[model samples]
Target: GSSGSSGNVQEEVTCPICLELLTEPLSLDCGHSLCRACITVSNKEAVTSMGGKSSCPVCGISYSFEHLQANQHLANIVE
Candidate 1:
Protein backbone atom coordinates (compact mmCIF):
# COMPACT_ATOMS: atom_id res chain seq x y z
CA GLY A 1 0.00 0.00 0.00
CA SER A 2 2.57 2.52 -1.16
CA SER A 3 2.88 4.82 -4.12
CA GLY A 4 4.60 7.91 -5.46
CA SER A 5 1.31 9.72 -5.06
CA SER A 6 0.34 13.31 -4.49
CA GLY A 7 -2.42 15.04 -2.48
CA ASN A 8 -2.94 11.82 -0.61
CA VAL A 9 0.19 12.80 1.27
CA GLN A 10 -1.95 15.34 3.09
CA GLU A 11 -3.95 12.73 4.95
CA GLU A 12 -0.88 10.85 6.16
CA VAL A 13 0.50 13.95 7.78
CA THR A 14 -2.17 14.19 10.45
CA CYS A 15 -1.41 13.28 14.02
CA PRO A 16 -3.46 10.32 15.23
CA ILE A 17 -3.83 11.80 18.71
CA CYS A 18 -4.87 15.29 17.60
CA LEU A 19 -6.28 14.47 14.17
CA GLU A 20 -4.76 17.71 12.93
CA LEU A 21 -2.05 18.47 10.40
CA LEU A 22 1.28 17.64 11.94
CA THR A 23 3.42 20.42 13.32
CA GLU A 24 7.06 19.92 14.16
CA PRO A 25 6.34 16.38 13.16
CA LEU A 26 8.03 13.25 14.37
CA SER A 27 7.70 9.61 13.33
CA LEU A 28 7.94 6.60 15.59
CA ASP A 29 9.50 3.23 14.83
CA CYS A 30 6.07 1.71 14.46
CA GLY A 31 5.57 3.99 11.44
CA HIS A 32 3.01 6.18 13.18
CA SER A 33 3.45 9.92 12.88
CA LEU A 34 2.43 12.75 15.21
CA CYS A 35 2.92 16.35 16.19
CA ARG A 36 5.89 16.95 18.41
CA ALA A 37 3.80 18.58 21.12
CA CYS A 38 1.30 15.76 20.96
CA ILE A 39 4.08 13.20 21.25
CA THR A 40 5.45 14.99 24.29
CA VAL A 41 2.11 14.64 26.01
CA SER A 42 1.80 10.98 25.04
CA ASN A 43 4.52 10.27 27.55
CA LYS A 44 1.68 10.06 30.05
CA GLU A 45 0.43 6.99 28.22
CA ALA A 46 3.71 5.20 28.81
CA VAL A 47 3.90 1.90 30.61
CA THR A 48 3.49 2.53 34.34
CA SER A 49 6.67 0.80 35.46
CA MET A 50 8.69 1.58 32.36
CA GLY A 51 9.84 5.13 32.88
CA GLY A 52 11.42 5.64 29.46
CA LYS A 53 9.25 3.99 26.87
CA SER A 54 5.91 4.77 25.29
CA SER A 55 3.62 2.86 22.96
CA CYS A 56 2.42 4.18 19.65
CA PRO A 57 -1.12 5.45 20.24
CA VAL A 58 -2.10 4.35 16.77
CA CYS A 59 -0.86 0.79 17.05
CA GLY A 60 0.15 0.20 20.69
CA ILE A 61 3.68 -0.77 19.69
CA SER A 62 6.37 0.16 22.21
CA TYR A 63 9.30 2.43 21.43
CA SER A 64 11.78 4.56 23.28
CA PHE A 65 11.88 8.33 22.98
CA GLU A 66 15.03 7.75 20.96
CA HIS A 67 12.97 5.97 18.36
CA LEU A 68 11.39 9.25 17.42
CA GLN A 69 12.89 10.89 14.38
CA ALA A 70 12.28 14.27 12.85
CA ASN A 71 9.98 13.97 9.87
CA GLN A 72 10.91 17.32 8.39
CA HIS A 73 10.27 16.06 4.85
CA LEU A 74 6.62 15.82 5.85
CA ALA A 75 6.76 19.36 7.19
CA ASN A 76 8.31 20.51 3.94
CA ILE A 77 5.42 19.01 2.07
CA VAL A 78 2.93 20.69 4.38
CA GLU A 79 4.60 23.99 3.68
Candidate 2:
Protein backbone atom coordinates (compact mmCIF):
# COMPACT_ATOMS: atom_id res chain seq x y z
CA GLY A 1 0.00 0.00 0.00
CA SER A 2 1.26 3.53 -0.85
CA SER A 3 -0.05 6.89 0.26
CA GLY A 4 0.90 10.37 -0.96
CA SER A 5 2.73 12.38 1.69
CA SER A 6 4.41 15.78 1.90
CA GLY A 7 7.47 16.04 4.11
CA ASN A 8 10.18 18.63 4.53
CA VAL A 9 13.83 17.68 4.68
CA GLN A 10 16.62 19.97 5.86
CA GLU A 11 20.37 19.96 5.38
CA GLU A 12 23.13 20.70 7.87
CA VAL A 13 25.90 23.10 6.94
CA THR A 14 29.02 23.97 8.88
CA CYS A 15 30.89 27.21 8.38
CA PRO A 16 34.32 26.76 6.86
CA ILE A 17 35.86 28.97 9.54
CA CYS A 18 34.00 28.09 12.75
CA LEU A 19 32.81 24.73 11.51
CA GLU A 20 29.27 25.77 12.38
CA LEU A 21 26.34 27.37 10.64
CA LEU A 22 27.54 30.82 9.55
CA THR A 23 26.44 33.48 12.00
CA GLU A 24 27.61 36.49 9.98
CA PRO A 25 28.67 34.87 6.71
CA LEU A 26 31.83 36.83 5.92
CA SER A 27 33.95 35.97 2.91
CA LEU A 28 37.70 36.31 3.37
CA ASP A 29 40.59 37.16 1.10
CA CYS A 30 41.93 33.61 1.07
CA GLY A 31 38.54 32.55 -0.23
CA HIS A 32 37.84 31.43 3.32
CA SER A 33 35.06 32.46 5.76
CA LEU A 34 34.42 34.27 9.04
CA CYS A 35 31.78 36.01 11.18
CA ARG A 36 33.62 39.06 12.49
CA ALA A 37 32.67 41.29 9.56
CA CYS A 38 36.43 41.12 9.08
CA ILE A 39 36.38 43.57 11.94
CA THR A 40 35.76 45.97 9.08
CA VAL A 41 33.83 48.58 11.11
CA SER A 42 36.81 49.01 13.44
CA ASN A 43 39.25 49.82 10.67
CA LYS A 44 39.83 53.56 10.19
CA GLU A 45 42.38 53.39 7.37
CA ALA A 46 39.90 54.34 4.64
CA VAL A 47 41.20 51.12 3.18
CA THR A 48 38.05 50.46 1.22
CA SER A 49 39.07 53.21 -1.20
CA MET A 50 42.70 52.28 -1.31
CA GLY A 51 44.46 49.41 -3.09
CA GLY A 52 46.90 48.58 -0.35
CA LYS A 53 47.15 45.87 2.29
CA SER A 54 44.11 44.23 3.88
CA SER A 55 43.53 41.25 6.16
CA CYS A 56 41.16 38.37 5.85
CA PRO A 57 38.82 37.77 8.71
CA VAL A 58 39.01 34.01 8.63
CA CYS A 59 42.48 33.12 7.41
CA GLY A 60 44.01 36.43 8.55
CA ILE A 61 45.77 36.61 5.21
CA SER A 62 46.64 39.95 3.58
CA TYR A 63 45.10 40.76 0.20
CA SER A 64 43.57 43.48 -1.94
CA PHE A 65 39.87 44.26 -2.23
CA GLU A 66 39.87 43.14 -5.83
CA HIS A 67 40.67 39.65 -4.57
CA LEU A 68 37.95 39.71 -1.94
CA GLN A 69 34.42 39.12 -3.07
CA ALA A 70 31.57 37.88 -0.92
CA ASN A 71 29.82 34.67 -1.86
CA GLN A 72 26.23 35.65 -1.19
CA HIS A 73 25.22 32.36 -2.75
CA LEU A 74 26.79 30.48 0.16
CA ALA A 75 25.30 32.95 2.61
CA ASN A 76 21.79 32.46 1.28
CA ILE A 77 22.23 28.72 1.19
CA VAL A 78 23.38 28.59 4.81
CA GLU A 79 20.59 30.85 5.88
Candidate 3:
Protein backbone atom coordinates (compact mmCIF):
# COMPACT_ATOMS: atom_id res chain seq x y z
CA GLY A 1 0.00 0.00 0.00
CA SER A 2 1.40 3.39 -1.02
CA SER A 3 -0.07 6.83 -0.69
CA GLY A 4 2.84 8.81 -2.09
CA SER A 5 4.82 8.55 -5.26
CA SER A 6 5.62 11.08 -7.99
CA GLY A 7 2.06 11.39 -9.18
CA ASN A 8 2.25 12.75 -12.70
CA VAL A 9 2.70 10.16 -15.40
CA GLN A 10 2.81 12.86 -18.09
CA GLU A 11 6.47 13.45 -17.37
CA GLU A 12 7.11 9.77 -17.96
CA VAL A 13 6.29 10.30 -21.63
CA THR A 14 7.70 13.77 -21.98
CA CYS A 15 11.01 14.47 -23.62
CA PRO A 16 13.45 16.27 -21.34
CA ILE A 17 15.17 17.96 -24.28
CA CYS A 18 12.48 19.09 -26.73
CA LEU A 19 9.83 19.32 -24.04
CA GLU A 20 7.72 17.42 -26.54
CA LEU A 21 5.95 14.16 -25.78
CA LEU A 22 7.46 10.90 -26.94
CA THR A 23 7.22 10.09 -30.62
CA GLU A 24 9.77 7.31 -31.06
CA PRO A 25 10.86 6.63 -27.53
CA LEU A 26 14.25 5.31 -26.48
CA SER A 27 15.39 4.35 -23.01
CA LEU A 28 18.84 4.67 -21.47
CA ASP A 29 20.56 2.33 -19.02
CA CYS A 30 19.56 4.86 -16.38
CA GLY A 31 16.00 3.95 -17.35
CA HIS A 32 15.23 7.55 -18.21
CA SER A 33 13.26 7.91 -21.43
CA LEU A 34 13.02 10.53 -24.20
CA CYS A 35 12.23 10.81 -27.91
CA ARG A 36 14.48 9.62 -30.72
CA ALA A 37 14.93 12.93 -32.57
CA CYS A 38 15.76 14.79 -29.38
CA ILE A 39 18.47 12.35 -28.37
CA THR A 40 19.72 11.88 -31.92
CA VAL A 41 20.11 15.60 -32.53
CA SER A 42 21.96 15.97 -29.22
CA ASN A 43 24.08 12.95 -29.99
CA LYS A 44 25.19 14.63 -33.19
CA GLU A 45 27.33 16.82 -30.99
CA ALA A 46 28.86 13.85 -29.20
CA VAL A 47 32.29 13.96 -30.80
CA THR A 48 32.78 17.63 -30.02
CA SER A 49 30.93 17.41 -26.73
CA MET A 50 33.20 14.56 -25.61
CA GLY A 51 30.19 12.38 -25.10
CA GLY A 52 31.76 9.27 -26.53
CA LYS A 53 29.09 7.06 -25.10
CA SER A 54 26.36 9.60 -25.98
CA SER A 55 24.68 10.66 -22.76
CA CYS A 56 20.99 10.73 -22.13
CA PRO A 57 20.14 14.42 -21.89
CA VAL A 58 17.62 13.60 -19.20
CA CYS A 59 20.21 12.44 -16.63
CA GLY A 60 23.63 12.22 -18.28
CA ILE A 61 23.45 8.45 -18.47
CA SER A 62 25.95 7.25 -21.02
CA TYR A 63 24.43 5.20 -23.88
CA SER A 64 25.47 3.65 -27.14
CA PHE A 65 23.65 3.70 -30.49
CA GLU A 66 22.66 0.08 -30.03
CA HIS A 67 22.24 0.19 -26.27
CA LEU A 68 18.91 2.04 -26.57
CA GLN A 69 15.71 0.41 -27.80
CA ALA A 70 12.00 1.09 -27.99
CA ASN A 71 9.45 -0.24 -25.51
CA GLN A 72 6.45 -1.65 -27.38
CA HIS A 73 4.70 -2.49 -24.13
CA LEU A 74 5.03 1.05 -22.94
CA ALA A 75 4.28 2.16 -26.49
CA ASN A 76 0.89 0.53 -26.25
CA ILE A 77 0.14 2.45 -23.07
CA VAL A 78 1.18 5.72 -24.67
CA GLU A 79 -0.46 4.81 -27.94
Candidate 4:
Protein backbone atom coordinates (compact mmCIF):
# COMPACT_ATOMS: atom_id res chain seq x y z
CA GLY A 1 0.00 0.00 0.00
CA SER A 2 2.90 2.34 0.78
CA SER A 3 4.83 1.07 -2.23
CA GLY A 4 4.50 4.43 -4.04
CA SER A 5 5.21 6.50 -0.97
CA SER A 6 8.64 7.36 -2.16
CA GLY A 7 8.16 9.74 -5.04
CA ASN A 8 10.66 11.28 -7.44
CA VAL A 9 12.32 13.68 -5.03
CA GLN A 10 15.38 13.28 -7.21
CA GLU A 11 13.67 15.27 -9.93
CA GLU A 12 13.88 18.34 -7.70
CA VAL A 13 17.65 18.07 -7.78
CA THR A 14 18.00 17.04 -11.42
CA CYS A 15 19.75 19.27 -13.90
CA PRO A 16 17.90 20.33 -17.00
CA ILE A 17 20.96 20.16 -19.24
CA CYS A 18 22.25 16.73 -18.22
CA LEU A 19 18.95 15.27 -16.99
CA GLU A 20 20.75 13.85 -13.98
CA LEU A 21 21.31 14.69 -10.34
CA LEU A 22 23.27 17.91 -10.03
CA THR A 23 26.99 17.89 -9.35
CA GLU A 24 28.38 21.09 -7.94
CA PRO A 25 25.16 22.94 -8.38
CA LEU A 26 24.89 26.70 -8.81
CA SER A 27 22.12 29.25 -8.86
CA LEU A 28 21.56 31.95 -11.45
CA ASP A 29 20.60 35.50 -10.67
CA CYS A 30 17.22 34.64 -12.03
CA GLY A 31 16.99 32.09 -9.20
CA HIS A 32 16.98 28.96 -11.36
CA SER A 33 19.42 26.23 -10.49
CA LEU A 34 21.58 23.99 -12.68
CA CYS A 35 24.75 21.98 -12.51
CA ARG A 36 27.87 24.14 -12.55
CA ALA A 37 29.46 22.16 -15.34
CA CYS A 38 26.26 22.28 -17.36
CA ILE A 39 25.99 26.06 -17.01
CA THR A 40 29.63 26.61 -17.81
CA VAL A 41 29.34 24.53 -20.96
CA SER A 42 26.10 26.21 -21.97
CA ASN A 43 27.60 29.63 -21.33
CA LYS A 44 30.58 28.85 -23.52
CA GLU A 45 28.25 27.90 -26.33
CA ALA A 46 25.87 30.81 -25.82
CA VAL A 47 28.47 33.51 -25.31
CA THR A 48 28.48 35.92 -28.20
CA SER A 49 31.44 36.51 -30.49
CA MET A 50 31.11 40.21 -29.55
CA GLY A 51 31.99 39.23 -25.94
CA GLY A 52 28.54 39.47 -24.50
CA LYS A 53 27.11 37.41 -21.66
CA SER A 54 24.98 34.31 -21.12
CA SER A 55 21.43 34.10 -19.89
CA CYS A 56 19.74 31.50 -17.82
CA PRO A 57 18.56 28.63 -20.03
CA VAL A 58 15.60 28.02 -17.81
CA CYS A 59 14.52 31.63 -17.17
CA GLY A 60 16.07 33.64 -20.00
CA ILE A 61 17.59 36.04 -17.47
CA SER A 62 21.06 37.39 -18.15
CA TYR A 63 23.87 36.44 -15.75
CA SER A 64 27.64 36.27 -15.43
CA PHE A 65 30.17 34.24 -13.50
CA GLU A 66 29.85 36.67 -10.61
CA HIS A 67 26.15 36.03 -10.60
CA LEU A 68 26.53 32.32 -10.18
CA GLN A 69 26.70 31.15 -6.59
CA ALA A 70 27.03 27.69 -5.13
CA ASN A 71 23.68 26.35 -3.94
CA GLN A 72 24.81 25.08 -0.58
CA HIS A 73 21.39 24.40 0.91
CA LEU A 74 20.27 22.30 -2.02
CA ALA A 75 23.63 20.61 -2.15
CA ASN A 76 23.24 19.46 1.42
CA ILE A 77 19.73 18.22 0.76
CA VAL A 78 20.74 16.40 -2.41
CA GLU A 79 23.69 14.82 -0.64
Candidate 5:
Protein backbone atom coordinates (compact mmCIF):
# COMPACT_ATOMS: atom_id res chain seq x y z
CA GLY A 1 0.00 0.00 0.00
CA SER A 2 2.08 2.85 -1.23
CA SER A 3 1.22 6.24 -2.59
CA GLY A 4 4.67 6.49 -4.16
CA SER A 5 7.25 3.88 -5.06
CA SER A 6 10.02 5.77 -3.22
CA GLY A 7 7.93 7.16 -0.37
CA ASN A 8 6.35 5.70 2.74
CA VAL A 9 2.82 6.02 1.53
CA GLN A 10 0.08 3.62 2.49
CA GLU A 11 -2.31 2.33 -0.12
CA GLU A 12 -5.71 3.76 0.57
CA VAL A 13 -9.16 3.87 -0.94
CA THR A 14 -11.33 6.86 -1.68
CA CYS A 15 -14.99 6.43 -0.93
CA PRO A 16 -17.56 7.47 -3.50
CA ILE A 17 -20.31 7.78 -0.94
CA CYS A 18 -18.42 10.20 1.25
CA LEU A 19 -16.06 11.43 -1.45
CA GLU A 20 -13.21 11.07 1.04
CA LEU A 21 -11.02 8.37 2.53
CA LEU A 22 -13.12 5.56 3.85
CA THR A 23 -13.46 5.81 7.59
CA GLU A 24 -13.65 2.05 7.90
CA PRO A 25 -14.52 0.44 4.64
CA LEU A 26 -16.98 -2.30 3.98
CA SER A 27 -16.10 -3.64 0.54
CA LEU A 28 -19.16 -4.93 -1.25
CA ASP A 29 -19.59 -6.73 -4.56
CA CYS A 30 -21.83 -3.89 -5.65
CA GLY A 31 -18.83 -1.57 -5.21
CA HIS A 32 -20.74 0.66 -2.83
CA SER A 33 -18.83 1.82 0.22
CA LEU A 34 -19.40 2.61 3.85
CA CYS A 35 -17.55 2.46 7.14
CA ARG A 36 -16.59 -1.00 8.43
CA ALA A 37 -18.58 -0.46 11.55
CA CYS A 38 -21.39 0.57 9.25
CA ILE A 39 -21.64 -3.04 8.19
CA THR A 40 -20.77 -5.04 11.33
CA VAL A 41 -23.80 -3.65 13.07
CA SER A 42 -26.00 -2.06 10.49
CA ASN A 43 -29.47 -0.67 10.84
CA LYS A 44 -30.71 -2.51 7.78
CA GLU A 45 -29.42 -5.89 8.93
CA ALA A 46 -30.67 -5.36 12.44
CA VAL A 47 -33.94 -4.16 11.12
CA THR A 48 -34.64 -7.37 9.22
CA SER A 49 -32.69 -9.89 11.28
CA MET A 50 -33.55 -8.53 14.69
CA GLY A 51 -37.21 -8.13 14.03
CA GLY A 52 -36.79 -4.44 13.32
CA LYS A 53 -34.59 -4.31 16.43
CA SER A 54 -30.95 -3.41 16.34
CA SER A 55 -27.94 -2.34 18.32
CA CYS A 56 -26.66 0.08 15.75
CA PRO A 57 -25.23 3.47 16.48
CA VAL A 58 -27.02 6.37 14.91
CA CYS A 59 -26.39 6.79 11.20
CA GLY A 60 -26.61 9.93 9.11
CA ILE A 61 -27.25 8.14 5.80
CA SER A 62 -28.81 5.14 4.13
CA TYR A 63 -27.21 1.71 3.54
CA SER A 64 -28.27 -1.09 1.23
CA PHE A 65 -29.05 -4.58 2.52
CA GLU A 66 -25.85 -6.16 1.15
CA HIS A 67 -23.72 -3.54 2.83
CA LEU A 68 -25.52 -4.24 6.07
CA GLN A 69 -24.90 -7.99 6.02
CA ALA A 70 -21.15 -7.94 5.47
CA ASN A 71 -18.98 -10.46 7.26
CA GLN A 72 -17.38 -8.89 10.32
CA HIS A 73 -14.85 -11.54 11.32
CA LEU A 74 -11.85 -9.36 11.78
CA ALA A 75 -8.55 -10.33 10.15
CA ASN A 76 -6.58 -7.57 11.87
CA ILE A 77 -6.77 -4.03 13.21
CA VAL A 78 -4.26 -1.23 12.88
CA GLU A 79 -2.38 -0.27 16.01
Candidate 6:
Protein backbone atom coordinates (compact mmCIF):
# COMPACT_ATOMS: atom_id res chain seq x y z
CA GLY A 1 0.00 0.00 0.00
CA SER A 2 1.25 3.47 -0.82
CA SER A 3 1.26 6.14 1.85
CA GLY A 4 -1.05 8.99 0.95
CA SER A 5 1.36 11.79 1.59
CA SER A 6 2.65 14.76 -0.26
CA GLY A 7 5.63 14.99 2.13
CA ASN A 8 5.65 18.77 2.23
CA VAL A 9 3.51 19.12 5.34
CA GLN A 10 3.46 22.90 5.42
CA GLU A 11 2.08 23.24 1.92
CA GLU A 12 -0.81 20.98 2.75
CA VAL A 13 -2.09 23.03 5.70
CA THR A 14 -0.99 26.63 5.57
CA CYS A 15 -3.44 29.50 5.45
CA PRO A 16 -2.64 31.77 2.55
CA ILE A 17 -3.19 34.94 4.56
CA CYS A 18 -1.27 34.19 7.72
CA LEU A 19 1.14 31.77 6.07
CA GLU A 20 0.58 29.38 8.93
CA LEU A 21 -1.49 26.36 9.69
CA LEU A 22 -5.18 27.24 9.57
CA THR A 23 -7.18 27.50 12.74
CA GLU A 24 -10.93 27.37 12.44
CA PRO A 25 -10.53 27.54 8.68
CA LEU A 26 -13.20 28.99 6.45
CA SER A 27 -13.48 28.73 2.67
CA LEU A 28 -14.58 31.60 0.50
CA ASP A 29 -16.53 31.51 -2.75
CA CYS A 30 -13.31 31.94 -4.67
CA GLY A 31 -12.02 28.65 -3.25
CA HIS A 32 -9.32 30.16 -1.08
CA SER A 33 -9.17 29.80 2.68
CA LEU A 34 -8.09 31.55 5.84
CA CYS A 35 -8.52 31.22 9.52
CA ARG A 36 -12.05 32.09 10.54
CA ALA A 37 -10.79 34.64 12.99
CA CYS A 38 -8.40 36.06 10.43
CA ILE A 39 -11.11 36.37 7.77
CA THR A 40 -13.56 37.83 10.25
CA VAL A 41 -11.20 40.63 11.05
CA SER A 42 -10.27 41.08 7.40
CA ASN A 43 -13.90 41.25 6.30
CA LYS A 44 -14.79 43.81 8.94
CA GLU A 45 -11.80 45.99 8.30
CA ALA A 46 -12.03 45.83 4.53
CA VAL A 47 -15.72 46.59 4.48
CA THR A 48 -15.32 49.39 6.97
CA SER A 49 -12.39 50.98 5.24
CA MET A 50 -13.46 50.25 1.66
CA GLY A 51 -16.99 51.60 2.14
CA GLY A 52 -18.98 48.35 2.53
CA LYS A 53 -17.32 45.82 0.27
CA SER A 54 -15.11 42.87 1.09
CA SER A 55 -13.28 40.47 -1.17
CA CYS A 56 -11.22 37.35 -1.26
CA PRO A 57 -7.74 38.28 -0.05
CA VAL A 58 -6.15 35.90 -2.51
CA CYS A 59 -8.15 36.27 -5.73
CA GLY A 60 -9.98 39.53 -5.03
CA ILE A 61 -13.29 37.84 -5.68
CA SER A 62 -16.26 39.40 -3.89
CA TYR A 63 -17.12 37.45 -0.78
CA SER A 64 -19.49 37.57 2.13
CA PHE A 65 -18.67 36.26 5.55
CA GLU A 66 -22.22 35.03 5.93
CA HIS A 67 -21.77 32.67 3.01
CA LEU A 68 -18.37 31.27 3.95
CA GLN A 69 -18.18 27.59 4.82
CA ALA A 70 -15.99 25.90 7.41
CA ASN A 71 -13.15 23.95 5.84
CA GLN A 72 -13.87 20.99 8.03
CA HIS A 73 -12.06 18.48 5.87
CA LEU A 74 -8.91 20.50 5.87
CA ALA A 75 -9.29 21.18 9.53
CA ASN A 76 -9.53 17.47 10.19
CA ILE A 77 -6.36 16.74 8.25
CA VAL A 78 -4.44 19.54 9.89
CA GLU A 79 -5.66 18.53 13.29
Q: Return the top candidate by lDDT.
A: 1
Q: Indicate whether candidate 2 or candidate 4 has the larger TM-score.
A: 4
TM-score of each: 0.52, 0.33, 0.50, 0.53, 0.28, 0.50
> lDDT tens digits, residues 1-77, model 5?
75656777666466544456676665454445556544454436344353542222332344445544565785356
TM-score of 4: 0.53
TM-score quality measure for candidate 6:
0.50
Off by over 4 Å in 1: 1-11, 42-52, 67-79
Quote the lDDT for 36 in model 5: 59
On TM-score, who's better, 1 or 3? Answer: 1
Question: lDDT tens string, model 3, 1-79?
Answer: 7766866554467786888767678667778777766665542544545534456777775556553454534543425
Off by over 4 Å in 6: 1-12, 42-50, 66-79
For 15-79, candidate 6 gives per-residue lDDT tens digits of 77778877666667767777766565442545435465545777688866665455544544425
**Per-prediction CA RMSD (Å):** 10.5, 10.9, 9.6, 8.0, 11.5, 9.7
| Per-model CA lDDT versus the true structure | 0.66, 0.52, 0.63, 0.63, 0.49, 0.63
Model 3 alpha-carbon drift over 4 Å, by segment: 1-11, 42-53, 66-79
Compare the candidates by TM-score and give the number of the best one: 4
Report the number of clashing residue pairs per model. 0, 0, 0, 0, 2, 0
Q: What is the C-alpha local distance difference test score of candidate 1?
A: 0.66
lDDT of 1 at 41: 50
**Root-mean-square deviation of candidate 1:** 10.5
Please write out the lDDT profile of model 2 over residues 1-79, one tens digit for every residue: 5555555656433355346566655554566555554344554666558653445534466765553454534553435
Candidate 2 ranges beyond 4 A from true positions: 1-21, 36-38, 43-54, 68-79
The true-versus-predicted C-alpha distance at residue 61 of model 2, in Å, is 1.8
Q: Write candidate 4's Cα lDDT for 16-49 as tens digits.
A: 7677877667766766678766665443443455
